[PDB]
């Protein structure tokens, strides 16, 4: 593998959701550790659990993997990190200050900005601090889908620019934030990210035109940030030997070949590695030890409920919010577009929204349909809207110097997040009179947006003197659908997401097993084995996790445009 050639200390595996960042990161960490190196594997995705991949109980603590000598694993928990940050800020004054003052200080640290900054501080401590990672020769970061990862990697530069501009009064974080003591650390992080001899950035993609376009956009953004000498890894490439004697495999292979040949002109120069599709789920060392090397090398008739029944059930309501959630890459955007176009074709007023920052619905819907309002949440426009709204609502009474200080405070990088939340809330407020199909951002970001803990609400009311959850908790006006894949890790992640939703009072309305190879009768031996492995996950979802569910096959033609999207609802 090209990226496994004189690797630097740090290696970032970025890309669109579901492309194989975690699988490839685990495989490379295993390969490096087995070579005699001291490797640490950091997982920056809140919604994923590398313990299921490795079979060990990896947690926030740096836990060695017994199966692989010299390999250790770590998971950055935003909530645990926030609790540790709050404790280290509040403990010195426990008893010293009056209990009322302690309660007030704890109140000031309950906002979502503190939750963001704690995780960011842990990330930059892993990047820069030397004592913290002294006994590791390599640190492999496995990031969340690109939508959140680009913001994570932009945060170092944004915070460094905010601090070095002389505007250190990030009143959102509180008077005890003490951002200045991290001023150098953040700066160091930037210098660590933009140095090709310290960090290697690997963009993981799949042989699909939409994925390749999004990866090209991500590469443009990262190059703008300052990261140089990136590598590219195309994963899930169906072997060319399976195309024979299987029309489905032949169509998939032809589509992947065309996507590779039509790669965006920007990515044609990056050193490119190719990872094939394997007949087994990449769980455990036995399956992860043979991911980066090619395998030497009647169909199942599946009859499961379709998605037309779910769309009929949604339409029977006549209005409300349909929120699509799940693991990255499961097909949330495709299914959102399909539901929206089907409802629009049924003569209903539909509003299709995308909460993902790095979103482009044109990859799916390239037409201008009728009875369909397609929109997206632009973080920059929303940030400017929120900034102006706060300035006029709260800055009117403040004097000129007060208004200037408020403007400096509103320019902190955390503001965008709360701005996005506001936008999200506003959108959710229009679902009572028309269908609102919301394709959500990565699972962790969306779960924070739901604001079950009230952090975002506290922050926005602090900056500005019915919450979304009060509406999501009400089945009469919302329908949360969990999109999964008929695979081990996707199903476990969906089960954990469902548990998180139920803990907050939200009961998912249905499950959608997307791109199931079992449903699409496949004759090639590889696809036969994949379907055989998918049967158990389908049974687990049907009998255990989901009471109402739908199964969508693996379409031979990638679903793009109104015709194909409406066809996967009526197969
Ligand atoms: N049934 C299907 N058959 C074939 N390809 C599919 C199917 N469903 C989705 N895809 C393809 O899966 C790719 C990734 O799915 P998609 O972008 O819709 O998922 P997502 O949940 O929005 O992902 P992410 O969280 O990474 O943004 C898309 O290119 C889409 O073409
Ligand atoms: N080369 C491959 N061959 C077969 N299956 C693969 C391959 N790469 C990934 N997968 C499957 O992809 C599924 C999702 O991949 P994975 O969890 O590695 O993605 P990710 O990029 O970490 O996802 P997320 O964005 O949600 O964090 C896993 O079930 C794994 O089985
Ligand atoms: As803030
Ligand atoms: Mg992952
Ligand atoms: Mg999406």
Question: Which two tokens mark 22?
Answer: 């975690």
The verdict on the CB of residue 415 being under 6 Å from ligand 3 is yes
State the DSSP H helix or E strand holding residue 232, giving kind and residue range, or none if neither: strand 231-237
> Is residue 75 marked as binding?
no
256 burial class (0-12, 13-18, 19+ CB within 10 angstroms)?
buried
Distance from the CA of 400 to the center of ligand 3, in angstroms? 22
CA dist., res. 338 & res. 332, Å (int): 10
Distance from the CA of 421 to the center of ligand 1, in angstroms? 25
Distance from the CA of 354 to the center of ligand 4, in angstroms? 21
Count CB neighbours of 69 within 10 A: 11
> Is residue 341 marked as binding?
no
Which of 331, 337, 493, 514 to mutate to test ligand 1, by most ligand atoms within 8 A of the CB atom? Answer: 331
Q: Which residue in this structure is represented by tokens 């110097």? A: 401
**CB 176 within 8 Å of CB 105:** yes
Q: Parallel, antiparallel, or unpaired: how do β-strands 510-516 and 478-485 relate?
A: parallel
Resolution (A): 3.0
Distance from the CA of 170 to the center of ligand 3, in angstroms? 7
Q: Which one, of 323, 358, 283, 326, lies nearest residue 444 by Cα?
A: 326
Q: What share of the chain is helix, strand, coil (3-state, %, to 5)?
A: 50, 15, 35
> Is residue 108 marked as binding?
no
Count CB neighbours of 421 within 10 A: 25
Distance from the CA of 263 to the center of ligand 5, in angstroms? 20
The verdict on the CB of residue 172 being under 6 Å from ligand 3 is yes
> Can you list the domains of the chain with their CATH numbers?
10-288 (3.40.50.300), 307-567 (3.40.50.300)
Tell me which residue has its CA closest to atom 26 in ligand 2.
Answer: 328
Question: Which two tokens mark 564?
Answer: 């194909």
CA dist., res. 93 & res. 100, Å (int): 12
189 burial class (0-12, 13-18, 19+ CB within 10 angstroms)?
buried
The verdict on the CB of residue 114 being under 6 Å from ligand 3 is no
Alpha carbon 17 to its chain's center: 6
> Is residue 209 marked as binding?
no
Q: Which one, of 66, 82, 26, lies nearest residue 49 by Cα?
A: 26
Which strand ranges, in their side-by-side order, compose the sheet holding 350-354?
372-374, 350-354, 435-439, 320-326, 478-485, 510-516, 549-553
Which protein residues have their CB within 5 A of the ion that is ligand 4?
Answer: 21-22, 45, 48
Q: How was this model experimentally determined? A: cryo-EM
**What residues have CB less than 8 Å from 303, skipping those under 6 apart?**
none
Question: Which two tokens mark 2?
Answer: 């090209």
**What residues have CB less than 8 Å from 365, skipping those under 6 apart?**
337, 340, 341, 352, 374, 561, 562, 565
The verdict on the CB of residue 179 being under 6 Å from ligand 3 is no
Distance from the CA of 112 to the center of ligand 2, in angstroms? 30
Rg, C-alpha atoms of the chain: 24
CA dist., res. 312 & res. 56, Å (int): 43
> Is residue 19 marked as binding?
yes
CA dist., res. 396 & res. 164, Å (int): 28
> Is residue 326 marked as binding?
no
Distance from the CA of 560 to the center of ligand 1, in angstroms? 10
**CB 438 within 8 Å of CB 323:** yes
Q: Which one, of 86, 70, 67, lies nearest residue 78 by Cα?
A: 86
The verdict on the CB of residue 20 being under 6 Å from ligand 1 is no
State the DSSP H helix or E strand holding residue 25, giving kind and residue range, or none if neither: helix 21-34
Which residues lie across from 482 on neighbouring strands?
325, 511
CA dist., res. 252 & res. 517, Å (int): 12
Give the Cα-Cα-Cα angle 245, 234, 514 (nearest 5 degrees). 65
The verdict on the CB of residue 145 being under 6 Å from ligand 1 is yes
Ligand nearest to the CA of 23: 2
Q: Which one, of 489, 20, 493, lies nearest residue 215 by Cα?
A: 20
Distance from the CA of 92 to the center of ligand 2, in angstroms? 44
Query: Which DSSP string do the residues of 89-153 spell out, in sequence order?
Result: HHGGGBTTB-HHHHHHHHHHT-SHHHHHHHHHHHHHHHHH-SSTTTT-SEEEEEPPPHHHHHHHH
Question: Which two tokens mark 271?
Answer: 């050193």
Q: Which one, of 446, 440, 396, lies nearest residue 417 by Cα?
A: 446
Q: Parallel, antiparallel, or unpaired: how do β-strands 320-326 and 350-354 relate?
A: unpaired
Count CB neighbours of 403 within 10 A: 15
- φ and ψ of 266, to 5 deg: -75, -35
For the chain, give the residues followed by a break (C–N over 2.5 Å): 297, 465
Count CB neighbours of 1 within 10 A: 18
Which whole-number Å values give the CA distances from 112 to 82, 147, 159, 407, 416, in the listed order? Answer: 9, 19, 16, 19, 12
**What residues have CB less than 8 Å from 552, skipping those under 6 apart?**
306, 307, 331, 335, 512, 513, 514, 515, 516, 519, 568
3-class SS at 419? helix
- φ and ψ of 272, to 5 deg: -110, 130
State the DSSP H helix or E strand holding residue 373, giving kind and residue range, or none if neither: strand 372-374
The verdict on the CB of residue 236 being under 6 Å from ligand 1 is no
Tell me which residue has its CA closest to atom 26 in ligand 1.
Answer: 17
**CB 141 within 8 Å of CB 10:** yes
**What residues have CB less than 8 Å from 526, skipping those under 6 apart?**
238, 239, 242, 249, 277, 279
CA dist., res. 444 & res. 489, Å (int): 16
CA dist., res. 217 & res. 221, Å (int): 6
Which parts of 232-356 fold into alpha helices (H)? 247-261, 285-288, 307-317, 332-345
Query: Which DSSP string do the residues of 170-213 spell out, in sequence order?
Result: -TTT-TT--GGGGHHHHHHHHHHHT-TTTEEEEEEEES-HHHHH
3-class SS at 423? helix
3-class SS at 349? coil
Query: Which DSSP string do the residues of 494-509 spell out, in sequence order?
Result: HHHHHHHHHHTT----
Distance from the CA of 331 to the center of ligand 5, in angstroms? 7
Q: Which residues line ligand 2 (CB under 6 A)?
A: 17-23, 45, 48, 144-145, 235-236, 275, 277-278, 281-282, 291, 327-329, 487, 489-490
CA dist., res. 312 & res. 441, Å (int): 25
Q: Which atom of ligand 2 is nearest to the CA of 145?
A: 25
What is the three-state SS of 517-557?
CCCCCCCCHHHHHHHHHHHHHHHHHHHHHCCCEEEEECCCC
Half-sphere exposure of 92 (CA within 13 A, CB side): 4
CA dist., res. 20 & res. 308, Å (int): 30
CB environment 487-497: b (16+ within 10 A), e (fewer): bbbbbbbbbbb
**What residues have CB less than 8 Å from 435, skipping those under 6 apart?**
314, 319, 320, 322, 340, 343, 348, 349, 350, 351
Q: Which one, of 520, 483, 486, lies nearest residue 330 by Cα?
A: 483
**What residues have CB less than 8 Å from 133, skipping those under 6 apart?**
40, 126, 139
CA dist., res. 475 & res. 509, Å (int): 8
Which residues lie across from 231 on neighbouring strands?
202
> Is residue 328 marked as binding?
yes
> Is residue 434 marked as binding?
no
Counted residue by residue, the chain has a size of 571
Alpha carbon 290 to its chain's center: 26
Q: Which one, of 76, 47, 160, 71, lies nearest residue 499 by Cα?
A: 47
Give the Cα-Cα-Cα angle 208, 148, 388 (nearest 5 degrees). 120
CA dist., res. 479 & res. 485, Å (int): 19
> Is residue 99 marked as binding?
no
- φ and ψ of 241, to 5 deg: -75, -15
Which strand ranges, in their side-by-side order, compose the sheet holding 71-75?
63-64, 71-75, 39-43, 138-142, 10-15, 199-206, 231-237, 272-276
């Amino acid at each position: 593998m090209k990226f496994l050639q004189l690797p630097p200390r740090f290696m970032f595996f970025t890309g669109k959701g579901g492309v194989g960042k975690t699988s490839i990161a685990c495989a490379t960490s295993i390969q490096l550790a087995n070579a005699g190196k001291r490797v640490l594997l950091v997982s920056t995705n809140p919604a994923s659990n590398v313990g299921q991949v490795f079979g060990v109980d990896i947690g926030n603590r740096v836990t060695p993997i017994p199966a692989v000598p010299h390999l250790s694993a770590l998971e950055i928990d935003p909530e645990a990190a926030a609790s540790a940050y709050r404790e280290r800020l509040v403990g010195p004054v426990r008893g010293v200050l009056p209990d009322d003052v302690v309660k007030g200080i704890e109140e000031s640290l309950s906002g979502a900005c503190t939750t963001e900054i704690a995780a960011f501080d842990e990330f930059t401590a892993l990047l820069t601090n030397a004592v913290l990672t002294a006994d590791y020769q390599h640190i492999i970061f496995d990031t969340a889908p690109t939508g959140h990862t680009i913001r994570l990697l932009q945060l170092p530069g944004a915070w460094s620019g905010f601090l070095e501009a002389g505007k250190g009064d990030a009143s959102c974080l509180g008077p005890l934030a003490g951002l200045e003591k991290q001023r150098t650390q953040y700066k160091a992080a930037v210098e660590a990210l933009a140095d090709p001899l310290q960090t290697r950035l690997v963009l993981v993609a799949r042989a699909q035109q939409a994925t390749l376009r999004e990866v090209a956009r991500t590469h443009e953004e990262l190059a703008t940030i300052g990261i140089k000498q990136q590598h590219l890894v195309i994963n899930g490439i169906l072997p060319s030997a399976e195309a024979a004697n299987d029309p489905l495999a032949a169509a998939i292979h032809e589509r992947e070949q065309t996507a590779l040949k039509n790669i965006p002109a920007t990515l044609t120069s990056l050193p490119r590695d190719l990872v094939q599709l394997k007949p087994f789920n990449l769980v455990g060392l036995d399956a992860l030890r043979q991911l980066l090397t090619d395998l030497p090398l009647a169909p199942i008739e599946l009859d499961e409920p379709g998605m037309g029944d779910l769309v009929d059930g949604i339409e029977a309501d006549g209005h409300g919010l349909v929120m699509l959630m799940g693991k990255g890459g499961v097909g949330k955007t495709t299914l959102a577009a399909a539901i929206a176009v089907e409802l629009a074709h049924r003569g209903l007023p539909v509003h299709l929204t995308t909460s993902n920052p790095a979103a482009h619905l044109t990859d799916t819907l390239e037409a201008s349909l009728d009875n369909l309002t397609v929109s997206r949440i632009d973080p920059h426009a929303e940030t400017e809207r929120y900034r102006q709204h706060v300035l006029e609502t709260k800055g009117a009474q403040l004097d000129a110097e007060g208004r200037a200080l408020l403007e400096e405070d509103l320019h902190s990088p955390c503001t965008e997040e709360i701005a996005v939340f506001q936008a999200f809330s506003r959108i959710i407020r229009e679902a009572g009179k028309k269908f609102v199909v919301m394709d959500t951002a990565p699972t962790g970001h969306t779960l924070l947006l739901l604001d079950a803990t009230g952090a975002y609400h506290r922050e926005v009311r602090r900056q500005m003197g019915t919450t979304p959850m009060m509406q999501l908790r009400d089945p009469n006006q919302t329908k949360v659908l969990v999109v999964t894949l008929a695979e081990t890790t996707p199903v476990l992640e969906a089960a954990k997401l469902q548990a998180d939703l139920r803990r907050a009072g939200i009961e998912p309305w249905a499950w959608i097993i997307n791109t199931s190879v079992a449903a699409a009768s496949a004759k090639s031996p590889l696809l036969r084995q994949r379907a055989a492995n998918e049967l158990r996950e389908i049974n687990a979802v049907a009998n255990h996790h989901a009471d109402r569910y739908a199964v969508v096959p693996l379409l031979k033609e990638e679903p793009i445009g109104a015709e194909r999207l409406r066809a996967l609802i009526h197969p």
